[PDB]
Amino acid sequence: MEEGGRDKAPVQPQQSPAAAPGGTDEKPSGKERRDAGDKDKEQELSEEDKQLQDELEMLVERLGEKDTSLYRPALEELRRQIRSSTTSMTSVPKPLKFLRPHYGKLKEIYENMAPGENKRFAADIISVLAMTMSGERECLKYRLVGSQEELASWGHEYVRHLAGEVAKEWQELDDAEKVQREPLLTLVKEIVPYNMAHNAEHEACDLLMEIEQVDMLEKDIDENAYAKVCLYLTSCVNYVPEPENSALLRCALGVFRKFSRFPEALRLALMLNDMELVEDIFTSCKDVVVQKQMAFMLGRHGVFLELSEDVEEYEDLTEIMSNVQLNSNFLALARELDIMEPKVPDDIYKTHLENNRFGGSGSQVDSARMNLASSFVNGFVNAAFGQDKLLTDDGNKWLYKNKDHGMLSAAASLGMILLWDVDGGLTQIDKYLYSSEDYIKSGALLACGIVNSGVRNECDPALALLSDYVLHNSNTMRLGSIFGLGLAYAGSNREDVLTLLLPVMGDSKSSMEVAGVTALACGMIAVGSCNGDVTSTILQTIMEKSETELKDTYARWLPLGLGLNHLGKGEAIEAILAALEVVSEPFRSFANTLVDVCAYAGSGNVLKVQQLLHICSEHFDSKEKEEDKDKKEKKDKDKKEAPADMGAHQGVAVLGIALIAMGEEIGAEMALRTFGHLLRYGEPTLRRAVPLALALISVSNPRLNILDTLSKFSHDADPEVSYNSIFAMGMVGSGTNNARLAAMLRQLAQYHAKDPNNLFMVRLAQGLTHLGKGTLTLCPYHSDRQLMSQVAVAGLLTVLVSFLDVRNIILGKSHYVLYGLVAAMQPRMLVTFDEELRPLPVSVRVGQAVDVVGQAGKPKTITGFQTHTTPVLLAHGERAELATEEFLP
Amino acid sequence: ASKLPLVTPHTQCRLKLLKLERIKDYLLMEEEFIRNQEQMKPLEEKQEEERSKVDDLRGTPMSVGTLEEIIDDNHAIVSTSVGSEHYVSILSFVDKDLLEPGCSVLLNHKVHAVIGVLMDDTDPLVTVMKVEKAPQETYADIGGLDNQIQEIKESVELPLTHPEYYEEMGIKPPKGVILYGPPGTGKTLLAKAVANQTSATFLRVVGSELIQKYLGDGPKLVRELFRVAEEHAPSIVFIDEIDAIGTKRYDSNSGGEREIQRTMLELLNQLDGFDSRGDVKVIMATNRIETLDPALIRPGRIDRKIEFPLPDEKTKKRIFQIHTSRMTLADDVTLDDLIMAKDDLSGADIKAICTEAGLMALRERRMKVTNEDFKKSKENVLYK
Amino acid sequence: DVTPNCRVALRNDSYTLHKILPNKVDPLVSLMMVEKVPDSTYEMIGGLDKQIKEIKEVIELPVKHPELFEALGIAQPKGVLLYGPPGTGKTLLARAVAHHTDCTFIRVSGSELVQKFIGEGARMVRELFVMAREHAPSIIFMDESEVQRTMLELLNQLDGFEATKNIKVIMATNRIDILDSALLRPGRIDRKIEFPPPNEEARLDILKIHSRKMNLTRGINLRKIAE
Amino acid sequence: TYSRQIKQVEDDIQQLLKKINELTGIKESDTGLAPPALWDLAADKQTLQSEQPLQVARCTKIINADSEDPKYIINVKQFAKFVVDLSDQVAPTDIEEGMRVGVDRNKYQIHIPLPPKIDPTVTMMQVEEKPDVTYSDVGGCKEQIEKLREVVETPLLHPERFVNLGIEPPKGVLLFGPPGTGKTLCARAVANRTDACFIRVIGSELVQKYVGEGARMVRELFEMARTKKACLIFFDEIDAIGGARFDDGAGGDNEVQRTMLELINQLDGFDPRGNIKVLMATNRPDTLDPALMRPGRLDRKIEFSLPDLEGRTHIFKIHARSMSVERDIRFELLARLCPNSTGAEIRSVCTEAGMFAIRARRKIATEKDFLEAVNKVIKSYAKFSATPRYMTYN
Ligand SMILES: Nc1ncnc2c1ncn2[C@@H]1O[C@H](COP(=O)(O)OP(=O)(O)OP(=O)(O)O)[C@@H](O)[C@H]1O
Ligand SMILES: Nc1ncnc2c1ncn2[C@@H]1O[C@H](COP(=O)(O)OP(=O)(O)OP(=O)(O)O)[C@@H](O)[C@H]1O
Ligand SMILES: Nc1ncnc2c1ncn2[C@@H]1O[C@H](COP(=O)(O)OP(=O)(O)O)[C@@H](O)[C@H]1O
């Protein structure tokens, strides 16, 4: 310990502040010149951020704190310069002069007067001087003042601009990663009124930098994936003009303001569609922005590009509508027939091979329900132009044999044979349509609504399925003619045929298998307005569901189209609109949780989760509302699909340990559909945790719950090595797990993963995380599998063709005007980069590099080389124009 | 445990805020999906009850068996400790994987069914041939060479520490490194500083101890040696004095020079096999570079050939300054007279003269070393 | 209380542990028991007094006083070569020094009954170092080319590669001009000590110490017998 | 601003990960147990079902049967020999003699036949896995690639052009030349391309300690080889497995010669390997025995020489395609400076020539960097050069 000798700072700043009450009165020169020699020496001796152990900042306040407490308040005649020498010296060490109750008394030194132009002694220093002190201001002082005292005195008025020049002081000194420290100031400052600080920093951000918008930009989109409802409401509309005013990157506008479409205002992204139709620059980014407006996240847009300039750029709309959809056809017409796919692969039933020699002999399984699964030897393999001529004979000779819903099934498989088609899908039905059969005609014409899905051209606004519907006095002519029109027009918001399908609800006909899927058909059309649909559902719900206490034909079908009619908003008005609408006995208050959480698909509002588990957790429920708790766990299946790769880990760490092992009914019977709505992504954290409850058949329960989780477990697309865990389970499934109720189900499980080698992107996360409907077409099946009385009769309308929004599979696409370039691509693991050094290292899977139409995969991001510069849209979106530029010799 | 590998950010980013609050989403939502288990069906504890149900399946007489084959439908032929093998079945708590032919397993006492697997206490030979700690000081101990230090850092250290320079170049490091010169020139002494420098697993073998007395035990020792070398990770294998396999004949080896030859065939495979080799660097040293097989010295098996010349006199004085650093040198001595004492003295000669001179001081209990200690020290060391 | 490499009592019905069986052997106590070296002392040294002082400087000092070499900043010696004709006191000297400084006098001979306590095959010689670092203040001794390669294989480990100290080697042989030049590297060997045949003075005292256990007759004139 | 507030919200939720994952049960780091959720198949049913009804059924070996009766003669590991009987679950057809069978401990009767012993050191030398070496990487010896590939895979991939012409294709080939010439690397393209069992054999792995021990490994090799339909057996460095027979005075080097003669007998005569193709690769062929060198065992005889000029230039284009270079360099000048050079030497010129660019501060090498590689690799290492007493193969 070497003390003494060089003690000038523990002596003369120990003497002259002690002689400062002895030199304030009756000594006018020593009051100000020793305060000047105290000010500039504490300034210059604390500007450097290498000597943080200053010789005054932790040394003078052993007596200079009590001297300051009798120096600034107890003087009472403070003039105009001695406050500039006093409050500029006494305000610097005060976050470390005081201990942790500084937060109520930052103001007894500073709010006397802010001395002049405070950044003058905060130019070189980064954060020791007054930026940590300013975080202490905006942490506590502006929170207590601006809790209900926003429009106020000096505590807000100068604090706006003091929160302006310090926020520019973050982008003034070094341009390090302390740039992203500024939305901490803009955020913790006025958390709910975020617009008043983003107006103070938006134009300063416009004059900030043109390269320092991108890490702050993704910094703001991450924050804008979810928040509290007002924070996500305000910070997302403040997110929008940053690539518009400062930057002109301007091509990620549509897919990243689908974020900002539903919660804020449905006309706001229509004004941003106007902002798409203003920047009329050219052809490339103009093409690529409106590529996604048809069949990548939304539809219902094809009446807004018929202005007075219809030559090619406003004649883009038909090419958006069907010709790049014909490029989605051209994928499988030209680019999948050359890679692997033959006309009849057929060999997954051939992959069911060696059970005749696995343990003796075979030729034993002769179950009649096996041919329901042998319908998909035709059906599931024939996606992506699997057209068959005299190879549909497994549906032809079974089409005329038995199984009336199998006559609906083999005739309904033809739409899965001809998918995304308008060219001949009406012609391939007509050779098997004419049979004078209620079940063949309604399944085949139900497949007519499947073929034109996404086309929405002139196929049948009131042409074919209206002619199918007007025949009705009976079975599926009445039923399977409203499903395909909602399926094909699921992307449309046309009101007229919605009012053609409104008397289907208002008929009050006793065909309840039709009246339940009527709500599932009209719910797929609109997600916003038209309260008359909701009135039409609830009036028949009162006329029918009230005077009965019976099965889930009502519960699985009628409020689900109301959830689809009020999907996607966190405003918590629709829960008041629909929860107080069906005030009733609790079996009609089954619909309390439908519209409440169906509006809450992707957000973070965990206060919804505590009111999603804490009202009805167990209560031991002696056979009263087990279905209402199955639906209460069904609405725990969102908050789970669109948060994107974040917090999904212990989604699986305990989703075997919460209900499926030692619940009562909700997990042993229902809650493995949390894995059936969560993902198809594919990872062993659930993929090796589910056969510990699936290979455990546990036959003491109603074992078709576990067999209901069998095919659903096999719900996962992007085909993998799961033929072990499913073909072994079907190998024991020959002897045990009786084929009298499961022969459709095990090969339904096996044939589901590898439908076709491709087209496996149905999982509601596009670009990075945006939705793309994907829920209106997927939800009523996982709601529909109440695990009974629909594996044989009623649910064969849904179990075939429920989800049909398959936006194909890959992103390897050139789309130059000639279509002569192939690519320069390099597929990798999902993005690592947030912020680091210079060109931030993007990701780490450099070993793969492609140039052609090849596969997508689950966690992949794809970049390039060759100085092509990929200048189109810069984030994601799978149809880059791919122009090139070579100003780099 | 391997929950989320996104640990990039390195500032106050909101991604870091929202991602850790979304781990708080998977943990708050699903800690409320942890509460309900023993609330609804207690029925056991499941922390020890099912565990003691396994432990009541398996008996306390746990016989230790050995695998030799696997049939997939949880039964296989396992070897007893006697030798009389059985055809027992395999349980469900056996985690069907850590099962290789030759693995130590746990069987029943009654029906000898495959209860468990056993962690292997390895073999002592790995601990024998494996260097544990850093031997000595750094490259600053060496002095005077300064050229091939860049060569050994070039071929070994720089590929390890900087995996960027070869990738911006589109190139791979050179494979084999060989060291040759007069004896006592610091050939092993460089590998000492390498074993200081690296963080990779380091193995060292003398070329004399390759040879054996039984037939094929040499090449088998080679095969398990490179097995041990590969089965870890990034590794450095050092071979000292590999001429001794070809120079000296011993009567312990039953096979003649055409057993040494076949050992050289096996090693000649193990340098450049068709197999995927891995991250195993090879550093070799000898003094009779002219004697051994040039088929092993070809580029592809050894890429870098490094000669060590004799120390020049200006480097000699540096080596004197090294080995006389921390000693109480009396000012009687003149090192320049000690330089030209031998015209071709090695670096070991300097250190030997220094240590023996210290021995001459400790014969007389002094603290400093005088000139006559060196005068009779060069007579003792050099002239005999 | 359960030690590795220890016997136990066991019950037979359930194979429950009963009681710890006392002890058995070290794998080195049996080894030197098989070898049976003639234990010696200073009190049976016949006239080798300067050689005693030479061997104390190499062996005795870096046990009792290792800091004394860090007072000079030099490394401690490791290897001893004893040479001269047979029958000159090499074995009793090397046994004696370890006996007085309390080290594990472990000679190696390359036999095969020694083999079973070192290992099952012991493909190297280096597996002895397991027992050697377990008896860490130890001294390895060697007789008069398998010894010559063996010593090099030891010295290559204890060149800086073995970190455990207090392990030193002694080779005893004759005719130094026919051994290895790599063993004649000047930095390799730390000290070589010659043992001459005894003169008339040193033939007398071995008769003196050796004459102790005999029942004599008064008046012998041992000087004439030594002459 | 929320500097500690992001840190403690990080750490309490990363800790609360452990605070509930200990409540799940993955803990109690075992001595060979399963994870505690994994095993629940054998929880209540198979605990008393795969244990209590189930036997041990100790496996045995059949000596022979007899006529008119089952009356089997069994054999076990150490114990005595019994007259045993079938079960009712199996036919007496595949209870053929010299066969392992599972046998109960009390009645001592046969339950199920077993596959024979493979001696798993012979199992380990099946490759199970393929390298990535393409025939494009073996450029410079294209006619040798064709003359080899017409023998290796063309009857295997097309067994109709030879049968319908009426010829039986050859089964044997040796590959020989100087070291580093691309023989082993050339075989890596074969193990890349092919599809059947690729069982590799290195000649220094068969040298055993006992007498005749290695010859039985040849036997088990060809026994598991004849079980398969088609197989490719690779031989490397066959000078270790045999040169010739030269024995004079005291018997020296006898043991390897018996394994070599066993390999001869397993190659020709007495209902041959059938569909088993062999492929040798050696360094010096002059040492080899002529009865081994007889066609019918070693039909194709591929030499690997040095390239003339253009194969060398192609090798420059192989190893120099994927490295940052000056654009306007020429490789033909480099090939004129290497009259006698192997492809590994050319690769060392390239890989050193990039290190010259790594020497000072350059991202792409130059022509003079190549010239700095040529004089060092070619002319400064020219003391060793490894070739000239192997051109004559001595
Ligand atoms: N250039 C040098 N500078 C300083 N000390 C050296 C030098 N060369 C050798 N020495 C010393 O001499 C001793 C012997 O050196 P080293 O073991 O490297 O010789 P070598 O050539 O490896 O012998 P061999 O390879 O035949 O065993 C080392 O302990 C080292 O301290
Ligand atoms: N024609 C060639 N083209 C490119 N590289 C070659 C060529 N010939 C040899 N090489 C290089 O030689 C190296 C080793 O080849 P290989 O192991 O096949 O030699 P070999 O002829 O089998 O002799 P040895 O049996 O001694 O190894 C390979 O890494 C390869 O890069
Ligand atoms: N100085 C001595 N005093 C007494 N006995 C000695 C002396 N030197 C040698 N001997 C005798 O020689 C024997 C030891 O021989 P020694 O030379 O140590 O073995 P080696 O011949 O293997 O070197 C002892 O039994 C001892 O009687």
Ligand SMILES: [Mg+2]
């Ligand atoms: Mg050395």
Ligand SMILES: [Mg+2]
């Ligand atoms: Mg080779």
